[PDB]
Design a protein around this ligand. Sequence first.
Ligand SMILES: Cc1cc(-c2ccn3nc(N)c(C(=O)N[C@H]4C[C@H](O)C4)c3n2)cc2c1C(=O)N([C@@H](C)C1CC1)C2
Length: 824
Amino acid sequence: SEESQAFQRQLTALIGYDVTDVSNVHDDELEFTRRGLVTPRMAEVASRDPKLYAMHPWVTSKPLPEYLWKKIANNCIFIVIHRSTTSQTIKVSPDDTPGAILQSFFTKMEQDFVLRVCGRDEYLVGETPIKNFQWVRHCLKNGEEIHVVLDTPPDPALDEVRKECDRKFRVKIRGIDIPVLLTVFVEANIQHGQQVLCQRRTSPKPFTEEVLWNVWLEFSIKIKDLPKGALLNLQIYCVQLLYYVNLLLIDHRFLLRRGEYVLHMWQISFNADKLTSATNPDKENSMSISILLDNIALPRAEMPNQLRKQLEAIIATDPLNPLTAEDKELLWHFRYESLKHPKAYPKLFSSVKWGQQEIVAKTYQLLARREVWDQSALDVGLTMQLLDCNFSDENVRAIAVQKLESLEDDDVLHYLLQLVQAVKFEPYHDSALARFLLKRGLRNKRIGHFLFWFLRSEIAQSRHYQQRFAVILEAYLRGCGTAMLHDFTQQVQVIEMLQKVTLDIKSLEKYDVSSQVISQLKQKLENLQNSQLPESFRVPYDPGLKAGALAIEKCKVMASKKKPLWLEFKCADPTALSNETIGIIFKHGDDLRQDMLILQILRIMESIWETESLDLCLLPYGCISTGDKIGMIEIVKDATTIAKIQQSGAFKDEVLNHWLKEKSPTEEKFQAAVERFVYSCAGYCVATFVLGIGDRHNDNIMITETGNLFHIDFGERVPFVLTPDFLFVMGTSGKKTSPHFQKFQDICVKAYLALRHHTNLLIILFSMMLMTGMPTSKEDIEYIRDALTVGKNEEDAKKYFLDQIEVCRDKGWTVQFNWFLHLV
Ligand SMILES: Cc1cc(-c2ccn3nc(N)c(C(=O)N[C@H]4C[C@H](O)C4)c3n2)cc2c1C(=O)N([C@@H](C)C1CC1)C2
């Protein structure tokens, strides 16, 4: 009664939205959704192992790749256990568990200890080999030593949770109202997975602040034939589309929707925002439409060769390959043959007349005989397809979520962002996907941390979906535990402190930054640290890192038009061996949602390349959107742009080679940096060509002192950046060939073909990226299909990509120059 007052108040602040608010609704779905999610929360809180929940050991069951096996000498791993002062190095075999490693220590010198990593709140514990922890693999990858602190297991009490009809369907369009303002009409559609079943327009009246029709619109479709999730899509045109809004004809309690509705509309090729049951909360300025609904609840033969081959041909096509009327009818007639092929499912369930009850019944009868689907090896791409906008049946979407259950927590992180955005395609608030995210979020602190920030990011900058995500986020926070509630509170404060500074500082816009503006920043960062700021906080992009006090000397405003903040924190962990500060960039103004999605696809391409033992050394530096147009980015130490290397605005060839030569002390190291360059450049060439973001200016491409190339901004045409200065490191020039350039070619083709083996996964994540993260036509989605050379053999595709390399060779500097040329 009394204790709930402050706690709900608290939850609102972490969310950035009041989930008890009733100002922008016309039914109790969101409240029923809150009350519904209590069950899966309390089960997962009850079921989770309290010891391992606190430890959150970051583990994988995948094979350790062939490249990291070469780094291992003779079945031996050096691990350095530390006391408060002294430390000893242990020889360990990759197969050894935390337990077996702890037996070796006690013998050398009660088991109430755990091998915590130095500098980070990350642990080595549980029935897992030392090779199967992700932190150990990071050390082997980067060539770092493995440093550990023998200390106390953290008390699980810190993670404690608080207590608690054959008639036709019709709609009356009364009229439209707008406070402030050609002809105008209203188009009422009946939608199921953005497939228009039924459509009726009104008569075109003149456009004014009030336009009334009072017309019954009788549709073709009957009441009984309406499927669950069917979406009454009201739209206002004037030739051109101005406003839109949606209403679910069958509600969360399976009841037919009836009564008067004054729905406030959104304002302006398809987008994830167009599907939302959310009405516009800005009632002061928005367009409005009035409707009345007065209408009850929702309740063995040999196939020919040629048709079998015709059917198998249809299953073999990519997701974006459209099914004709003929293709669908074939898939349906032979649905029991189709059902034996898991890859058919998206096409099969796309080939269903969802506006007929008898057919949907048969579709549900078909989903019962699911032996092959349940037994099938998990395909994530195929699963993602069944959660996109094209599918809106609950039971269909459920079988996709069923396959996701088997994923490791390591795999959930790889797809978490895209799975969070997939919630936008759910017809109803409460869903199998939402519950899966919550359930896997509560089971694992790391997933839960990144879940919090993914939901909070959307809540801050999506009026279309903030209501939905908030209810989910409130449900996570109600079971995450006191420890994590405190951590999120400390993080949310720090971001709120820094959001104010960056907003005020920018006002004080010519590209050159003033000297006193830096001193003004340092004045405010003195002020912040003294009074309001918390002593430490978890780094949102890397929650293992505990960033403490703030190094005011090294902080500055960065020489850009958008004036981001170069920030630099001292580490909070005393066991931290390195004295190097935690560099963080904090930017404002840009919309990071789009780029954050592209980075997650880049992280996915790494894991594809890992499974085929290729280490292309991409950099997906920590990059989290922390709120409305603001986010924290990891500062890669020892890194600079190409443009600063060049301009030190002319163009030169030999400079990039000299920059590595000088910055590398020993000549033997320089070649390892050249090796790192050739891999990274190959990786960044392939990936940018696939995503269609290769044509880029030098300033947005960076390079480490250790030779690692990477990109920091995403958008005669060039397919990708392979300019002369890159090639001068590689050896070739003009019309010649070199050994490193042939190695570059070998990695690019092996990289390109590797990605082509997961063509469907890449296509669907690309398709989803454009729908969920943008203010998009089929032409836009159709690029990646052409870029991946769909339906073509490997030798044909090798030829394709090697020509794109030669296109960059033929043009050379021609495209780089045009940045400056078009500027005036
Ligand atoms: C603005 C920005 C800087 C970095 C970045 C990352 C790591 N590092 N390490 C360094 N040493 C630097 C660095 O010196 N950056 C200076 C910028 C130039 O003046 C040189 C760096 N930058 C990443 C992104 C951005 C940006 O907008 N993104 C977008 C694409 C994303 C949504 C937020 C990424």
